[PDB]
């Protein structure tokens, strides 16, 4: 018998991104080839199969720093982190290969899907 | 130049609610007349003016337990906590007064708005 407020989920995400901007209650640093990105473990888990596996592990859930594979591109990661917190993906000819490789590693299937479609269209 | 994945925000909220169900990375207990509710501080802050003020305070941000005013109804709080994590509000004739009073205390304006409208319609 519930009623639903259409904008609620987007408003929550907007506020989570504002907390990230303001570095409020961020609880992990993701290190990508020495570039560092502060984030909230719960948002990362909610968006990525890799982070869901990492932060549900009984030892890794307590880590304050996570180092990604050295082959991961920091710009690709930055673009995906922004997508996690905003639903908007800054996909460009110059970054699509890195974004797709990063999304495959992070296990973000919808992103991998749109990257494949954009690449196939340019062939 | 971004593209946007329409369902992303709702999918993130669905996953945050799954973490809450499974008590994964919950970091606060809200006590309402001895009833206890586990939650994520970031979701509470993202949904409520009261929790935003509490968890941005330099001392209160570190508390693992928050006690609400004794006049707050635990069922009203439970209904609002479910709304925070799902966008669905279980508003019924038997709970609307408690839900509205709780939403006013929690500073959730959209909820206070729909409660006022539903009450005005029954007058």
């Amino acid at each position: 018998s519930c009623i639903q407020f259409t904008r609620h989920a987007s408003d929550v995400l907007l506020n989570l991104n504002r907390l990230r901007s303001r570095d409020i209650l961020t609880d992990v640093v993701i290190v990508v080839s020495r570039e560092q990105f502060r984030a909230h473990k719960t948002v990362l888990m909610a968006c990525s199969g890799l982070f869901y596996s990492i932060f549900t592990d009984q030892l890794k859930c307590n880590l304050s720093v996570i180092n990604l594979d050295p082959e991961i591109n920091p710009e690709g990661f930055c673009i995906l982190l922004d997508f996690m917190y905003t639903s908007r993906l800054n996909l460009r000819e110059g970054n699509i290969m890195a974004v797709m490789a990063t999304a495959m590693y992070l296990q973000m299937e919808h992103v991998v899907d749109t990257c494949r479609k954009f690449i196939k269209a340019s062939e | 130049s971004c593209i946007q994945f329409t369902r992303h925000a709702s999918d993130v909220l669905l996953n945050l609610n799954r973490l809450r169900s499974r008590d994964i990375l919950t970091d606060v207990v809200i006590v309402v007349s001895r009833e206890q509710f586990r939650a994520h501080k970031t979701v509470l802050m993202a949904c409520s003016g009261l929790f935003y003020s509490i968890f941005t305070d330099q001392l209160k941000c570190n508390l693992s337990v928050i006690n609400l005013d004794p006049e707050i109804n635990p069922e009203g709080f439970c209904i609002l906590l479910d709304f925070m994590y799902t966008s669905r509000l279980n508003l019924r004739e038997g709970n609307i007064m408690a839900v509205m009073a709780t939403a006013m205390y929690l500073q959730m304006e959209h909820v206070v708005d729909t409660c006022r409208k539903f009450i005005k319609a029954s007058e």
Binding site: I3, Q4, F5 | R88, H110
Partner: peptide
């Protein structure tokens, strides 16, 4: 906003 889901 509010709707019947």
């Amino acid at each position: 906003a509010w709707v019947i889901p």
